[PDB]
């Protein structure tokens, strides 16, 4: 009926005399504490266990009593840690000059705790002494404590006030630290919420440090500095997307992209397209002018990064417009030839093909297997050239094994000429699909193209779910229908399969069954395929129920789930779309800055005393950037909820 | 009307994918083009009761891939009278890959970004409509043009 | 290259001595102002046309200098409004003791402004002096002033502090006021944003007033009070959804719903349905028992509202399975009978049809004509019963003009027997669709059923735009294809239209063209319908392009638009779904509380002195509810950003 | 700050006119944004503009254009244009009579003032209930 | 003349809404610093 309540976690109660002592300390009564500490007769005094009359003194940051305990031999213990957390400078140096339960883990060090608070003044005061942060990497002996110690160390290293005070190159260490913390959010898969916040903090510090640049001279000194646009390439390597997409960094990049050319045009977008097509038409003239005279008024005009990109685009566009004129302009009746020689276009499309393979290999020397697969557009490029090698090789094989001409209806099942035609057609799809990557250069279609590919990975996760439901139902339908497989002789027009006028043998084999359930997603499989000649009503009804259940799961449940996660993913992506696109466009621009492979694929087939000064200039600019950043962040650190406490403390002095 | 411009940007992505697959299908199927005489009741193309010559020419191939968005192209158009199996299977795989990209990926992408745009537009809908209605009203304040077109001449 | 800056609207500047006067009052100095005022009888012309120091005295609520100024005849003007806005009680009553630019509109009065602030103490102070509020009704002039004046009046009447002080029945006036402000949010369509906030505030006041009830006796007094569950019925008519859906109001209603019969709260989900079924099977014996022995042990069982609901549902359910049995029991003998008499089923379902008509008329006159219309489940009931009248009447007519039997294949085109069969089948769909309304009684399917109907209006608006696009494209296709219309004789199986095996004449007439474009939404129109026998390639291509353009607009643009707004609407609706469902379930429950129409339709066709005390009890409870509400509101009105200012005021006295 | 701005303007101050772009691109862009951030001040317009409503119309439209041409600094220019659009709307919210509203909307610089608002796409100004 | 009245009302309202708790506490503390009596 009732629930009696008692104290289970019993404690040693403080005496009434002891409570008065702490009450006097809490009110700053110097006189009472002095007499109460005057009984040096060795009783109730402070021992290694203590009670502590110093934490409350630190709590109120009243310096008068705080010094009164220290000379009376009170066990300080971890008192310095409590002072640092309070962020009171006066109490910290008082305890510094005087050099069982705790609210701090035993791995916490005074320099570590100061960096956690990000207090510039206290961190600086501590570093004027010997301080050393342990280097992060024993996990088996105690795993909980090892993980917490590692996170505490990284939380101190990632402090903007510590980096600005003790890093030779604050920008570089923020790049490395942000990358390291991003990796740890995966390997240390349990503590990912705290490491990601630390990584985002390091990325902000470098971005805010360059925001203090006041002139273009300062900005170019930072971005062109070599450790031993070098600094901008390091930012791309570490995936510093916010740093790269800064308006001043983007403005400097556009100056080198357009170069002398007045490409900064933004008016009457119609004439932009008309003007852009002008250079593309005369692209071969620019290529030959550079080939025969690198130094000329028109010779170096192709050297412009924006002009070079247009020339390469028009050269590629000619290739696609060249294969398109191969089934509509050349082949009239030379199709009964068993093995044909390369035609007029094939001979005159061959140099384009060789340039692509040579260009791919020539850039394969830089980098290697790594840093190349992770670019998915290079995966497409590998497929085109591999397929282009197969059709070229398969064409000359049929040129030596066949000489006569026979009607196509009499050729073999796997004739080499037929195989090459299939491989060539697949390459044409891949070649035209590469024009999508050119959309990054456009400010209207760029963000959309980047967004489209940014969530194709969520599609792959779903298609693995669907591929298992498809295989489950294909097993059942084939296990029920394989008894009634009929030969192509008995079918009308000698046609067997689902590509006939009358679809038949839809579930006869497992290979056919997998295709039948694929085409039912688009409604291209008729319902009469669930019928067999034996007219066994029970068997046919069961098969139609398997087919109907598969349709409900796929077209009502799975595809509606797919729509649901596009909506959720697109909302998150749309916020970061502008930064993501500008990072991608930057990599496109820098690929045309360097002096290498400037000629189009149709033409490319033809085969220290100063360093000491530059480091001094970089350090001088870095010193000014840090000074402006520290002054700014100090101003924003002040808040009304903090000034009220200080204003109250000064107003306490009414004794006068 | 406020977000028909976003549709236009998407329709340029689709037109590039449409052109890529129409090139491959026409490059594979143009050898087997047949005359209208050899087809039943002298009908050639996909507008016939028995669809034929779906990928014979580039102009026909572009229409065939358009009508497959609405499911109006039958699957037997991937078959040819020669019956080389390998050629017909490759063509049906090009057709199937185009269907996945368009009807499962691109159209669902359009739905996702159409939902996001409508959220931002709906907040400003009242202000946008009242601005448009004001221009309608002020067009009838002027004295000129009072008479309707049947009498204004 | 420079923009000079000047003061364009410059007024008279305050001189040095006047400015010194102003800052003397600002700092609270008395002797300076007193001496300055005592010597300002000759050079300072303080009059009805002078400038003022009273407002700053009110601002710092320094009553001493404020009191001083009235002693020297300073033009007060509308300084009382400034004191009321500051919400300082001392300054208000001081200004009340003594009997061109302003920050207030000329229509604002002291009582109206006090109600805007919702300050209980100041409003009470002013009301004690016999104040009045103008009654709300463009004007002869200043339509702008009329709109602002009306909103200012309603902003004062809708003040909870004013209602609590000067309303005989605060709950009723909050009901009426909230309804009135909801109407004004449409008629005054320009100022809807402010009126909606006022209406929401009134609906909250009544809800928070009943939240102060502390016993079921108090709640029953409020809800059963008749001004001339009466008070709960008034809340339904004013659409007080939040008031009705309160957990204590819903709890009281539940005890009346289960009129002593077990509350059905500890039954299993599967067990729940099992013991619901047995009561339904016993409905025939319960109805007759009440008919012969109403005062019996089981005669009054049907009086319980929840039992009556189950009995009526089972009686209706028997009718639906009964129609379902009509098509599986009649022999094919009547197939050739021209005019058949009602069969075994038709004769034995006739009384149940009349019960629905009699019940419909009974509740039609009770609600009038406007209450009946505003219920979309009654439109279905009217249409369903009208079709049953036509079906019965048309069978009688066919019974007198036909006696023999003829095969149906040679029957007339519009035979009356055929027409009746079509009308009977349509009403069968409507009868079964009526079972959806029963979902409101369920806690799982209830909120979902209410959600589906809550935005069918948005579908209707969208379907009007689509119908105009459909009409536009049906005009062009018919204008292009009507030349090639062919007779049914020339078609293969004497079949004309799109309902044949080989579709033809899809766009021959406008009526056919409208159906063809409807069925193309679901993909049921084949592409060869764009082909005509003349084989004119130009016109056939044009027709297919207009057909293709319609498909893009409908199936890619319009239907995706529908999904977008249907998703946005669902997010807003889902927040209020629980309140909306509970309001709907309440109306369902109260319909079974009344004695009228206790018997199901199969059986329903068979043929003051005390009012003074009740008002006293209601007023006593209202007094306690208001007192608790005012105390809670006053306590909750305290804030950190308000308490600090008064702490500074007392601290600034410092006279010791 | 209305009081400090008025104090300084009385001492015959000036502001450079916004448009040299190649000597220092970073400094030129920041200088231009600083000038427009001062011109778009509601307290400066209220003190030193002959027609505050027309000034906010032109300035708000000019800042909208700059949010495209200066495509890199669009975030700061967008909130400056929105600030000018709000000022004109809030200034007309102080009308207390239909005579005052009719004087404003029918004024010809030489419903003329309402036609100018449609030209500059002042949608919030046009859609005001009054 | 109308513009002058509109600006005057706008400025008076703008000054009132510029007052805040986070700022009023500052000069409230500063006034109390005049504790010399
Ligand atoms: C998967 N499936 C299917 O394959 N077919 C084709 C069979 C061969 O053509 C169908 O017709 C078919 C079908 N699901 C269908 O809806 C149903 C049917 C039953 C249920 C449900 C849905 C849910 C899951 C809601 N539930 O509560 C039960 C009672 C189990 N129906 C229509 C149908 C057909 C006959 C009858 Cl007696 C009743 C309904
Ligand atoms: C594009 N495409 C197609 O065109 N057809 C028709 C061919 C001619 O009719 C199909 O049948 C077809 C098809 N994609 C299909 O699903 C697949 C198949 C394989 C994969 C995947 C999906 C994913 C991308 C998830 N992945 O991991 C792999 C392994 C590459 N299937 C069904 C099918 C058919 C035969 C087999 Cl052995 C296995 C599956
Ligand atoms: C409405 N419409 C249609 O009705 N048909 C059937 C005609 C009869 O069957 C189609 O084939 C068809 C079609 N829209 C189609 O895509 C297009 C085509 C052109 C454009 C666009 C989309 C957009 C609007 C993006 N734009 O920029 C232009 C250049 C105007 N195509 C496919 C097609 C067919 C032939 C060619 Cl040469 C090129 C493309
Ligand atoms: C034969 C078929 C397969 C060709 C396909 C036609 C189009 C889809 C292609 C052909 C030319 C391409 C264009 C070539 C050059 C440009 C200019 C380029 O301009 C920029 O915005 C970048 C330069 C700058 O503004 O700084 C943007 C991409 C664009 C429009 C390309 C986008 C894709 C286009 C229109
Ligand atoms: C029989 C077939 C053709 C289905 C078509 C009819 C159903 C849609 C109807 C018939 C009986 C109805 C039920 C009759 C009684 C109740 C009890 C009612 O529950 C309560 O009043 C207490 C339990 C709770 O709080 O949910 C909830 C609605 C429910 C299940 C009804 C929901 C709708 C039902 C299932
Ligand atoms: Ca490559
Ligand atoms: Ca009814």
Residue C208 CA, chain-centre distance (Å), reads 20
Spatial neighbors of C164 by CB under 8 A, at least 6 apart, are: C120, C170, C626, C629, C630
CB C374 within 8 A of CB C239: no
With contact defined as 3+ CB pairs under 8 Å, the chains touching E are A, C, D
DSSP state, residue C337: B
Cα–Cα distance measured from residue C145 to residue D101, given in angstroms and rounded to the nearest whole number: 11
Least Cα distance to C372 among C453, C381, C358, C312 occurs for C381
The answer to whether the Cβ–Cβ distance between A647 and E29 falls below 8 Å is yes
| Beta-carbon contacts below 8 Å between A and E | 13
With contact defined as beta carbons under 8 Å apart, do A107 and A138 qualify? no
User: Hey, whose CA ends up nearest to atom 28 of ligand 5?
Assistant: C442
* Pair type for strands C2-4 and D14-16: antiparallel
Buried b (16+ CB within 10 A) or exposed e, A227-252: eebebbebbbebebbbbbbbbbbbbb
> What tokens does C245 get?
């859906």
∠ CA A310-A316-A319, nearest 5°, is 145
Nearest-neighbour CA in chain D from A266: distance (Å): 7
Nearest to C502 among B42, B49, B67 (CB): B49
**What is the distance between the alpha carbons of residues B90 and B98, in angstroms, rounded to a whole number?**
12
Residue located via tokens 């772009």: D21
Could C2 and D16 be called an inter-chain contact, meaning their C-beta atoms sit closer than 8 Å? Answer: yes
Which residue's entry shows tokens 């549902």? C313
Give CA–CA dist C109/C90, Å, rounded: 19
Show the tokens assigned to C120.
């209980």
The residue behind tokens 């209220």 is D46
- Phi/psi for C142 (5° steps) reads 60, 65
User: How many of the other CB atoms lie within 10 Å of CB of A386?
Assistant: 12
Strand, coil or helix: A405 = strand
Can you tell me the distance from the alpha carbon of C343 to that of A457, in angstroms, rounded to the nearest whole number? 65
Distance CA A305, CA C278 (A): 85
DSSP secondary-structure letter at A503? -
Q: Is A557 in the pocket of ligand 1 (CB under 6 A)?
A: no
Q: C110 Cβ partners below 8 Å, 6+ apart?
A: C80, C81, C84, C126, C131
Distance CA C80, CA C94 (A): 10
Q: CB of C605 closer than 6 A to ligand 5?
A: no
How many CB atoms are closer than 10 A to CB A82?
22
Phi and psi at residue A640, to the nearest 5°: -65, -35
Residue C594: which residues within 8 A CB-CB, separation 6 or more? none
Map residue D15 onto helix, strand or coil.
Answer: strand
- List of E strands, C31-109: none
Query: With contact defined as beta carbons under 8 Å apart, do C462 and C565 qualify?
Result: yes
B 112-141 → D contacts, CB under 8 A: 126-128, 130-131, 134-135, 138
Burial class (CB in 10 A: 0-12, 13-18, 19+), B52: buried
Main-chain dihedrals φ then ψ at residue B147, nearest 5 degrees: -75, 145
Which two structure tokens, joined as six digits, stand for D68? 């495209």
Cα A344 off chain centre by: 47
Which residue of A lies nearest to D74 if distances are taken between CA atoms? A247
Chain E nearest-CA distance from D38, in A, is 18
Within C362-519, strands assigned E span none
Radius of gyration, CA atoms only, chain C: 38
Chain D hits for C144, Cβ within 8 Å: 95-98, 100-101, 130
User: DSSP character for C559?
Assistant: H
Identify the DSSP state of A247: H
- CB of B28 closer than 8 Å to CB of B90: yes
Task: Name the DSSP class of C27.
Answer: T
DSSP secondary structure, A244-260, as one string: HT-HHHHHHHHHHHHTT
Distance CA A344, CA A267 (A): 44
Closest C-alpha to C565, from B104, B127, B111: B111
Ligand nearest to the CA of C591: 7
CA–CA distance, A34 with A45 (Å, rounded to integer): 13
- Measured between CA atoms, the residue of chain E closest to residue A642 is E22
Q: Give, rounded to a whole angstrom, the gap between the first and last alpha carbons of chain E.
A: 48
Chains C and D touch (3+ CB pairs under 8 A): yes
Helix, strand, or coil (residue A300): coil
Q: Which residues contact C182 (CB under 8 A, 6 or more apart)?
A: C195, C196, C199, C239
**Contact, B26 vs A327, CB < 8 A?**
yes
Name residue, tokens 């009243």. A62
Q: Which helix (H) or strand (E) holds D14?
A: strand D14-16
The phi and psi torsions of A522 (rounded to 5 degrees) equal: -100, 10
C555 Cα to the center of ligand 1, angstroms:
28
Specify which residues A405 forms β-bridges with. A337
Q: How far apart are CA C122 and CA D47, in angstroms?
A: 38
Q: Which two tokens stand for residue C317?
A: 């359910």
Sequence ranges of the binding site of C for Ca(2+): 360, 363, 378, 381
Q: Based on the number of CB atoms within 10 Å of its own CB, is C70 exposed (0-12), middle (13-18) or buried (19 or more)?
A: middle
Identify from D23, D25, D31 which residue to disrupt to test chain A contact, counting A C-beta atoms within 10 A and taking the largest count. D25
Number of helices (H) and strands (E), helices first, in chain A?
31, 0
Cβ within 8 Å of residue C67, ≥6 positions away: C94
Q: How far apart, in Å, are the Cα atoms of A641 and each of A58, A631, B101?
A: 20, 20, 56
Residue A15 CB coordination number (10 Å): 10
CA distances for B121 relative to A21, B1, B125, angstroms: 67, 11, 6
Two structure tokens written together for A151? 């996170």
Rounded Cα distance, A584 and A600, in Å = 22
Terminus-to-terminus CA distance in chain D, angstroms? 30
C298 contacts: CB under 8 Å, gap ≥ 6: C286, C289
Intra-chain end-to-end CA distance of chain A, in Å: 62
For chain B, what is the total number of helices (H) and then of strands (E)? 6, 0
D17 DSSP 8-state letter: P
The C-alpha atoms of residue E12 and residue D38 are separated, in whole angstroms, by 21
Asked whether C428 and C387 are in contact (CB, 8 A), the reply is no
Q: Which of C2, E28, C479 is nearest to A647 (CA)?
A: E28
Chains in contact with chain B (at least 3 beta-carbon pairs closer than 8 A):
A, C, D
Calculate how far, in angstroms, residue A432's C-alpha sits from the geometric centre of ligand 6: 14
Rg (CA), chain B: 24
DSSP state of E1: -
Three-state SS string across A593-614, please?
CCCCCCCCHHHHCCCCHHHHHH
D19 marked as part of a ligand binding site: yes
Distance CA D74, CA D66 (A): 8
CB atoms within 10 A of CB A330: 12
CA-only gyration radius of chain D, Å: 16
Supply A236's token pair: 């791309």
Q: And the tokens for B4?
A: 């028909």
How far from the centroid of its chain's Cα atoms is residue A475's Cα?
40
Q: Which residues of C belong to the annotated binding site for Zn(2+)?
A: 137
Q: Are C27 and C35 in contact (CB under 8 A)?
A: no
Cα distances (angstroms) measured from residue A429 to each of A242, A293, B95, C72, D72? 35, 37, 12, 96, 37
Between CA C449 and CA C452 the distance in angstroms is 5
CA dihedral C622, C624, C627, C632 (to 10 degrees): -110
Q: Is D122 exposed, middle or buried (0-12, 13-18, 19+ CB in 10 A)?
A: buried
* Residue D16 host element (H or E): strand D14-16
Give the sign of the dihedral formed by CA C586, CA C589, CA C593, CA C596: positive
How far is it, in rounded angstroms, from Cα B10 to Cα C104?
54
User: ∠ CA C549-C554-C558 to the nearest 5 degrees?
Assistant: 130
Cβ atoms A597, A359 nearer than 8 A: yes
**Look-up of token digits 């046919």:** A540
CA–CA separation, C424 vs C327, rounded Å? 12
Distance from CA of residue C527 to its chain's centroid?
Answer: 47
Tokens of D106: 């029918």
Beta-carbon-side half-sphere exposure of residue A221 (alpha carbons within 13 Å): 21
Query: Chain C contact for E21, CB < 8 A?
Result: yes
Measured CA angle at C376 (ends C375, C379), to 5 deg:
100
CA distance C110 to C123: 9
* Spatial separation of the C-alpha atoms in residues D22 and C501, rounded to whole Å: 76
| Closest D-chain CA to B136 | D118
What DSSP letter does each residue of B66-130 carry, written as one string? HHTTTT-S-GGGG--TT--SHHHHHHHHHHHHHHHIIIIIIHHHHHHHHHHHHHHHHHTHHHHHH
CB-CB contact of A356 with A384 (8 Å): yes
Helix, strand or coil for residue C634?
helix
Distances A330 to A479, B31, C216, C411 between C-alpha atoms, Å: 50, 12, 95, 66
For the CA atoms of C475, C480, C483, C489, the dihedral, rounded to the nearest 10 degrees, stands at -70
Please tell me the distance from the alpha carbon of residue A220 to that of residue A236, in angstroms, as a whole number.
17
Closest-CA residue of chain A to D66: A266
Q: Whose C-alpha lies nearest to ligand 2, atom 10? A: A515
Cβ proximity of C240 and C206 under 8 Å: yes
- φ and ψ at C28, to 5 degrees? 85, 10
Yes or no: say if C55 and C80 are a contact pair by the CB < 8 Å rule. no
3-state secondary structure of A514: helix
CB contact (8 A) between residue A266 and residue D73: no
Q: Whose CA is nearest to atom 15 of ligand 2?
A: A518
Choose among C28, C655, E33, C650: nearest CA to A656: E33
List binding-site positions of A for Ca(2+): 360, 363, 378, 381
Give residues with Cβ within 8 angstroms of C176, minimum separation 6.
C238
d(C-alpha C304, C-alpha C311), whole Å: 11
CA-CA distance, B58 to B66, in Å (whole number)? 13
C-alpha distance from residue A276 to each of A272, A311, A444, A595, C64 (Å): 6, 10, 16, 23, 80
Closest CA relative to residue A619, chosen from A142, A345, A221: A221
For chain B, the straight-line distance linking the first and the last C-alpha, in angstroms and rounded, comes to 32
User: How far is C592 from C601, CA to CA, in rounded Å?
Assistant: 14
Q: How far apart are CA A620 and CA A221, in angstroms?
A: 10
Question: Rounded to whole angstroms, how far apart are CA atoms A188 and A195?
Answer: 9
Three-class DSSP category at C405: strand
Q: What is the stated resolution of the deposited model, in angstroms? A: 2.6
- Spatial distance between the Cα atoms of D111 and A13, rounded to a whole number of angstroms: 84
* Chain B residue at shortest CA distance from C568: B119
In a mutagenesis test of the D interface, which of B128, B131, B132, B138 is the best target, namely the one with the most D β-carbons within 10 Å? B131
Query: Around Cβ A444, how many Cβ atoms within 10 Å?
Result: 12
Query: A254: number of CA atoms within 13 Å, CB side?
Result: 19
The answer to whether A381 touches A360, Cβ cutoff 8 Å, is yes
Report how far residue B105's alpha carbon sits from residue B94's, in angstroms, rounded to the nearest whole number.
16
- Please classify residue C114 by burial: count the beta carbons closer than 10 Å to its beta carbon, then call 0-12 exposed, 13-18 middle and 19+ buried: buried
Q: Which helix (H) or strand (E) holds A205?
A: helix A192-210
- Residue nearest atom 8 in ligand 5 by C-alpha distance: C435
H/E run at residue C4: strand C2-4
Cα distance between residue A91 and residue D26, in whole Å: 45
Distance from CA of C137 to the nearest CA of D (A): 19
Residue C472 burial by CB count (10 A; 0-12/13-18/19+): exposed, middle or buried?
exposed
- Cα–Cα distances (Å) from C198 to C164, C180, C240, in that order, read 16, 10, 14
How far is it, in rounded angstroms, from Cα A482 to Cα A513?
Answer: 10
């Amino acid at each position: 009926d009732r629930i009696p309540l008692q104290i289970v976690r019993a404690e040693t109660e403080l005496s009434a005399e002891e409570k008065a002592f702490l009450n006097a300390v809490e009110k700053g009564d110097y006189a009472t504490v002095k007499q109460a500490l005057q009984e040096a007769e060795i009783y109730y005094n402070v021992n290694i266990n203590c009670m502590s009359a110093l934490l409350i003194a630190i709590e109120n940051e009243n310096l008068e009593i705080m010094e009164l305990l220290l000379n009376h031999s009170v066990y300080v213990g971890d008192a310095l840690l409590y002072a640092i957390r309070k962020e009171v400078v006066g109490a910290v140096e008082l305890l510094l000059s005087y050099r069982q339960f705790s609210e701090f883990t035993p791995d916490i060090t005074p320099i570590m705790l100061a960096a956690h608070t990000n207090n510039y003044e206290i961190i600086k005061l501590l570093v004027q002494k010997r301080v050393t942060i342990p280097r992060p990497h024993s996990s088996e002996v105690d795993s909980l404590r090892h993980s917490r110690s590692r996170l505490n160390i990284y939380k101190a290293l990632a402090s903007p006030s510590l980096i600005a005070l003790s890093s030779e190159d604050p920008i570089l260490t923020a790049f490395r630290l942000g990358w390291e913390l991003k990796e740890l959010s995966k390997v240390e898969n349990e503590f990912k919420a705290e490491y990601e916040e630390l990584s985002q903090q390091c990325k902000l510090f470098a971005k805010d440090l360059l925001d203090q640049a006041r002139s273009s001279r300062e900005l170019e000194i930072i971005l062109n500095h070599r450790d031993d646009l070098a600094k901008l390439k390091v930012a791309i390597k570490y995936h510093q997307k916010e740093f790269v997409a800064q308006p001043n960094c983007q403005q400097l990049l556009a100056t080198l992209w357009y170069d002398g050319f007045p490409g900064w045009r933004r008016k009457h977008w119609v004439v932009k397209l008309l003007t852009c097509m002008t250079i593309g038409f005369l692209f071969p003239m620019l290529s030959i002018a550079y080939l025969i005279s690198p130094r000329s008024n028109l010779g170096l005009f192709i050297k412009k990064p924006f002009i070079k990109f247009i020339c390469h685009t028009a050269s590629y566009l000619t290739f696609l417009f060249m294969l398109l004129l191969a089934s509509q302009h050349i082949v009239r009746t030379d199709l009964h030839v068993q093995g044909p020689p390369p035609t007029v276009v094939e001979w005159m499309i061959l140099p384009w093909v060789l340039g692509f393979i040579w260009g791919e290999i020539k850039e394969m020397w830089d980098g290697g297997f790594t840093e190349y697969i992770h670019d998915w557009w290079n995966l497409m490029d590998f497929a085109m050239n591999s397929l282009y090698l197969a059709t070229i090789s398969l064409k000359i094989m049929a040129y030596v094994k066949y000489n006569g001409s026979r009607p196509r209806e009499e050729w073999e099942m796997w004739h080499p000429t037929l195989i090459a035609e299939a491989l060539f057609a697949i390459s044409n799809i891949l070649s035209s699909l590469r024009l999508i990557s050119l959309f990054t250069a456009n400010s209207h279609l760029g963000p959309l193209q980047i967004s489209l590919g940014r969530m194709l990975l969520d599609i792959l996760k779903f298609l693995f779910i669907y591929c298992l439901v498809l295989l489950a139902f294909a097993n059942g339908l084939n296990q029920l229908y394989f008894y009634y497989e009929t030969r192509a002789i008995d079918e009308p027009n000698n046609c067997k399969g689902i590509r006939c006028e009358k679809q038949n043998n839809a579930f006869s084999t497992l290979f056919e069954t997998l295709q039948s359930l694929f085409w039912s997603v688009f409604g291209l499989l008729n319902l009469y395929v669930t019928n067999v000649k034996a007219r066994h009503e029970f068997t046919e009804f069961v098969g139609a129920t398997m087919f109907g259940t598969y349709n409900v799961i796929s077209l009502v449940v799975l595809l509606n789930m797919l729509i649901a996660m596009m909506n959720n993913s697109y909302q998150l992506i749309a916020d970061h779309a502008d930064i993501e696109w500008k990072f991608a466009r930057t990599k496109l621009w820098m690929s045309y800055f360097d002096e290498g492979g400037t000629l189009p694929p149709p033409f490319n087939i033809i085969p220290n005393a100063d360093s000491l000064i530059q480091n001094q200039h970089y350090q001088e600019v870095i010193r000014n950037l840090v000074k402006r950043y520290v002054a700014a962040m100090i101003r924003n650190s002040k808040t009304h909820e903090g000034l009220t406490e200080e204003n109250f403390k000064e107003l306490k002095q009414d004794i006068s």
